[PDB]
From a paper:
The SAM complex consists of one copy each of Sam50, which spans the mitochondrial outer membrane, and Sam35 and Sam37, which sit on the cytosolic side of the membrane. Sam50 forms a 16-stranded β-barrel which is minimally closed between strands β1 and β16. The structures of Sam35 and Sam37 reveal that they each adopt a GST-like fold, which is also completely different from the BAM lipoproteins.
In addition to using lipid nanodiscs, we determined the SAM complex structure in the detergent GDN using cryoEM. In this sample, 3D reconstructions exhibited several conformations, with monomer and multiple dimer conformations present (here, the term monomer refers to the SAM complex, with one copy each of Sam50, Sam35, and Sam37; the dimer refers to two SAM complexes). However, we were able to determine a structure of the dimer with the most homogeneous conformation (dimer 1) at 3.2 Å resolution from 117,339 particles. Therefore, we performed particle symmetry expansion in dimer 1, focused on only half of the dimer, and proceeded to refine this monomer to a final resolution of 3.0 Å, resulting in more clearly resolved side chain densities.
Numbering used by the authors:
A (entry chain A): 26 to 128, 139 to 262, 264 to 289, 292 to 333
B (entry chain E): 47 to 73, 78 to 111, 127 to 171
C (entry chain C): -32 to -23, 2 to 75, 105 to 178, 237 to 424
D (entry chain B): 172 to 324, 329 to 512
E (entry chain F): 393 to 424
Write the structure that this text describes.
């Protein structure tokens, strides 16, 4: 009654048209521009798990790089449904609701209460291998180039800011490895052990080796090429999200001069190599048309 | 039955223990129980740890005493009237260090 | 350099906490290590020195000291790595990794986060095993650590009791099928993992705990774990664990070799120096680097010589702050005079 | 160290300043700021932790100049609610090394209640280009005019008012060129228009492209105003409290490409001809169609160091989703339109 | 150095202090 005219709303800017246009639901993962166009697996395991699960759910979606700040929660791998009106969009879907949004045949094998024994084996993946990956990436001087060109270089393009981003990444990973009592349990003043001086790394490496041996021995008794069932589930995706990246980015042939055979060769040779066969059988159910893995 | 002391965040356990452990030695003779709780919460005020505005005591079913710490640092200028015409001072107090201790500076 | 792996050149003595609950120790890692040593070596091989994180270079309490090679080894898993069908070892590793996390946050929910149990049961038991000025610095650090560890459970000092029951059952249902002590039953695992299971479960169900919800859950729904804990304690630690070969005169006589007034004053002064904001942050980092280099040297490797950049940075921050403060408060001597006279030249 | 009950959470600047060449007007400044504001109109936060170096030179005619070099960080890290795909796309990390020049030509008889004055103020800014590195690259221009004029009845203050404000945001390439691929603006740099100061009768962020309940800015904008500023009725030229009777206006367009389909892939790279056509079309859109409107009566209280309004306005013309306001329009600040 | 360090140490120790000596809730109960 009070306003007199209405005039065809104001046509959002260019960035809000080249990025958030969409036709398919888009999943925001830690990726790179050269890889996001092909849907190739991300380089962060916490996002590669959900990307693998969504690809197994036969969902048609798109992959766009993001930066962990634009999330409905703290962590990154969220999803945004397609835009229905050029000035309004549905709400985002956090990492927990990706499988609920995914619904073809049966989306029941991708979310299921694991048997009690499997809940014990899953701690090997979520703590042992995770702390191994965090120590080997964020606190190993050999992988400074990887850490930079993956997480820091495409963020700010400014040395005095890349420095602070690297520092905070390294400190935040040290604050996490220094909590799991596999390798770090030191007690200092009322502040976490936020440095590689309290994350003693031989224990972490040995825990990772034992975890990989145990997981290979668990896979050996399945008889159906997966972890007890017929099609890969959440356990297979959770293990893939670490073994694939360990084989890809941490398989450096420099080992003899230092010892401590890298994580990728540990994954390749663990047990009778059942883990490599597993990761190559998952690359062929989710990514059946992608070649050029194994470094 | 069971008594608690809510809000005594910076008071040592053995001090409140010396005060409130004999209170549980009254083994329904409600009168004597109330007299002992009153005597205890009164002796608790003869220290200078915490204020006197909120000495709550709740009974149920058992006992629940609510207290609120006074402060940890106090400053002042004031003006003293110690037999003289006037005296400007700067009184810096530290109300509690470990137990019920203090430390002034005038 | 403080955020990367270190650079290299081109008769055991277990350290534990005090008994404090009717068990040989607290901190179920230490108790599991004691139970492991007691079943493997024999009374004439270990010494069980009572200690605290300030008295070892590892800063981690289940610390063994080999006397033949003078190597420091911290943590339970590293200790049992030292001193030493495939589904047995597989399940051993699986359950060790499931106890070290998802059971340590549950034991730290009681006794550490609930302020009714910390102060009534736990804090006195920590103060009773530490030299006199230390109970003001170390028990709060241990509580802060075990409260940061018990996070991710979404719980705090808070009908809001069905949720604690669910959180405890989600763990005790995984532990319940292991057949923790028998010659027949479910899935036998190993000795070294049974001892860790005993450590955690016995510290879960035994203490007094004014608000004992965990003891109630364990005794009400899981009788197998209660029976296992009782029989294991009666078999390995008869009579409270006083027959364990502690140092010269028992438990309290063990904190004598490294509890002189000098060392205790040093420990207190370091623990209080680590709390001044900036200087303390960087002092803690430098001290931890020094101690890790010391442990590594004792292990047998040759670390990088030293990098005092951390202490230089902390001292620089402190000295620069105080110098700017003084230079801008007191200043410099006056730049002018009371009278200044000009006069034309001729 | 200034906090704020609503938006700002922190501040620390330290502002070391000296005169230059023994001249009391020509000064120099070296500031080091670290703030963390809040932008509820476009639901995020902003963390600035840079430092700038300024050279202010007050001229003898009453004018003023400035030349500053600023370098910031500009993190956007507060997307707690449901916000927009836009505020998520500009997720946040930048530098914005820039160089800005202001020019104030004040002639108003009263800075907080002009009656017989005039005012021209211009701000121009050249962000990363050539020697100026960084992440953003633009040339942002802002012009302001004013006025105040009494006509008739001593001195009873009728003081017919005035006003005008323009602005343009032009994205340039990133090095030593006027021709090249230039990336479009971010939510950090675009203009906001509306509220108790810019255009009264609108929400603190209104009058712009909206991605829901979230006010994303625009590049080319243009405002206006008319006043009456009548004195207190039947009372005369009394205390600062005066009456006000104002019209308003407002436009805030955003730069699209919409004219070159040769780009296709790599949408965040517009060649110079495309950017020129886009700014031309944006100005053309800003021309046609009645912009916006508002009107009301106010209670101006010209405090010495501030201004207080307590208005009551009713928006006449809007766009779809511009979040007009009608209830009591409280206003306070230094710069009003 | 002793004067300076002692002054600053006493100042800090009496301004910031030590971690709290008590808890929010402290519970007593009679023994049987």
């Amino acid at each position: 009654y009070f306003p007199l005219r209405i005039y065809e709303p104001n046509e959002l800017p260019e960035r809000s048209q080249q990025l958030t246009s969409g036709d398919l639901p888009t999943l925001y993962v830690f990726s790179t521009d050269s890889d996001a166009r092909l849907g190739l697996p991300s380089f962060n395991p916490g996002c590669l798990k959900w990307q693998t699960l969504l690809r197994l759910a036969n969902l048609d979606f798109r992959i766009l790089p993001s930066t962990n700040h634009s999330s409905p929660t703290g962590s990154l791998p969220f999803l945004l449904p397609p835009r229905t009106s050029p000035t309004a969009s549905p709400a985002p879907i956090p990492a927990s609701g990706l499988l609920s949004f995914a619904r073809d045949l049966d989306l029941g094998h991708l979310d299921a209460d694991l048997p009690p024994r499997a809940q014990a084996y899953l701690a090997l993946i979520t703590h042992s291998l995770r702390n191994a990956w965090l120590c080997a990436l964020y606190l190993d001087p050999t992988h400074d180039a990887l850490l930079r060109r993956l997480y820091v270089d495409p963020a700010s393009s400014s040395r005095a800011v890349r420095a602070a981003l690297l520092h905070q990444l390294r400190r935040a990973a040290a604050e996490q490895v220094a909590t799991a009592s596999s390798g770090g349990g030191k007690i200092v003043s009322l502040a976490p052990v936020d440095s590689a001086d309290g994350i003693d790394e031989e224990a972490v490496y040995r825990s990772a080796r034992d975890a990989l041996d145990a997981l290979a021995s668990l896979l050996r008794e399945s008889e159906t090429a997966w972890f007890g069932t017929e099609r890969p589930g959440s356990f297979d995706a959770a293990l893939f999200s670490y073994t694939h990246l360990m084989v890809e980015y941490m398989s450096e042939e420099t080992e003899s001069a230092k010892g401590r055979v890298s994580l990728g060769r540990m994954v390749k040779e663990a047990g009778n190599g059942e883990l490599a066969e597993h990761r190559e059988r998952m690359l062929g159910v989710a990514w059946p048309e992608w070649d050029g893995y194994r470094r | 039955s069971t008594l608690e002391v809510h809000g005594a965040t910076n008071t040592r356990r053995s001090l409140l223990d010396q005060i409130f452990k004999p209170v549980l030695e009254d083994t329904t003779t409600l009168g004597q129980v109330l007299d002992r709780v009153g005597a205890a919460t009164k002796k608790l005020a003869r220290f200078d740890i915490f204020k006197e505005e909120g000495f709550g005591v709740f009974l149920s079913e058992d006992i629940s005493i609510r207290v609120k710490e006074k402060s940890r640092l106090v400053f002042s200028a004031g003006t003293d009237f110690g037999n003289a015409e006037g005296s400007a001072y700067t009184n810096a107090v530290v109300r509690n260090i470990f137990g019920g201790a203090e430390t002034l500076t005038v | 350099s403080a955020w990367s792996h270190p650079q290299f050149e081109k008769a055991v003595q277990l350290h534990v906490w005090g008994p404090a609950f009717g068990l040989p120790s607290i901190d179920a890692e230490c108790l599991a290590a004691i139970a492991y040593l007691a079943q493997t070596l024999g009374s004439a091989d270990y010494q069980l020195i009572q200690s605290s994180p300030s008295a070892v270079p590892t800063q981690h309490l289940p610390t063994l000291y080999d006397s033949r090679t003078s190597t420091w080894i911290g943590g339970f898993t590293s200790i049992t790595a030292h001193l030493h069908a495939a589904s047995a070892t597989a399940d051993g590793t699986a359950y060790t990794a499931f106890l070290s996390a998802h059971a340590a946050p549950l034991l730290a929910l009681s006794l550490y986060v609930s302020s009714a149990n910390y102060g009534a049961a736990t804090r006195p038991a920590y103060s009773a095993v530490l030299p006199l000025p230390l109970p003001w610095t170390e028990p709060p650090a241990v509580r802060a650590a075990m409260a940061r560890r018990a996070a991710h459970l979404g719980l705090s000092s808070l009908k809001s009791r069905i949720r604690l029951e669910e959180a405890a059952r989600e763990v005790l249902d995984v532990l319940a099928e292991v057949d923790w002590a028998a010659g027949g039953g479910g899935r036998q695992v190993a000795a070294e993992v049974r001892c860790l299971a005993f450590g955690y479960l016995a510290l879960m169900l035994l203490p007094d705990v004014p608000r004992p919800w965990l003891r109630e859950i364990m005794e009400g729904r899981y009788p197998a774990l209660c029976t296992f804990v009782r029989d294991f304690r009666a078999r390995v630690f008869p009579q409270g664990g006083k027959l364990l070969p502690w140092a010269d005169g028992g438990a309290q006589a063990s904190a004598s070799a490294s509890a002189s007034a000098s060392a205790v004053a040093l420990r207190f002064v370091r623990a209080v120096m680590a709390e001044v904001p900036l200087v303390g942050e960087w002092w803690s980092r430098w001290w931890t680097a020094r101690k890790k280099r010391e442990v590594l040297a004792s292990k047998g490797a040759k670390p990088a010589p030293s990098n005092d950049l951390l202490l230089l940075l902390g001292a620089g921050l402190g000295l620069t702050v105080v110098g700017a403060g003084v230079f801008f408060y007191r200043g410099l001597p006056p730049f002018g005079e009371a009278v200044q006279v000009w006069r034309k030249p001729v | 160290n200034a906090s704020t009950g609503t938006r700002t959470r922190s501040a620390y600047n330290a502002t070391f300043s000296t005169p230059i060449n023994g001249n009391p007007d020509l000064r120099l400044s070296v500031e080091a700021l670290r703030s963390a504001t809040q932008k509820p109109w476009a639901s995020h936060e902003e963390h600035l932790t840079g430092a700038n170096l300024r050279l202010a030179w007050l001229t003898e005619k009453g004018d003023t100049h400035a030349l500053a070099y600023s370098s910031v960080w500009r993190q956007l890290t507060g997307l707690a609610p449901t916000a927009s795909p836009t505020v998520r796309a500009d997720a946040g990390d930048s530098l914005k090394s820039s160089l800005t020049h202001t020019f104030t030509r004040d002639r108003r008889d009263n800075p907080m209640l002009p009656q017989s004055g005039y005012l021209f103020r211009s701000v121009s800014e050249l962000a990363g280009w050539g020697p100026l590195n960084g992440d953003v690259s633009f040339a942002k221009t802002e012009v302001e005019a004013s006025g105040a004029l009494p006509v008739a009845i001593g001195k009873s203050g009728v003081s017919v008012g005035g006003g005008l404000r323009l602005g343009v945001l032009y994205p340039l390439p990133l090095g030593y060129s006027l021709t090249g691929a230039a990336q479009p603006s971010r939510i950090n740099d675009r203009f906001q228009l509306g509220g108790p100061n810019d255009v009264r009768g609108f929400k603190i962020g209104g009058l712009g492209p909206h991605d829901g309940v979230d006010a994303v800015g625009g590049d080319v904008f243009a405002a206006g105003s008319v006043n009456a500023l009548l004195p207190l009725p039947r009372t005369g030229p009394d205390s600062p409290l005066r009456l006000q009777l104002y019209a308003n206006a407002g436009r805030l367009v955003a730069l699209n490409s919409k004219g070159t389909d040769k780009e296709g892939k790599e949408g965040l790279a517009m060649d110079s001809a495309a950017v020129f056509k886009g700014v031309k079309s944006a100005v053309g859109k800003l021309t046609n169609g009645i912009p916006s409107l508002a009107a009301g009566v106010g209670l101006v209280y010209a405090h010495p160091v501030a201004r207080f309004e307590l208005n009551f306005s009713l928006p006449l013309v809007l766009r779809r989703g511009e979040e007009g306001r009608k209830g009591l329009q409280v206003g306070v600040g230094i710069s009003f339109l």
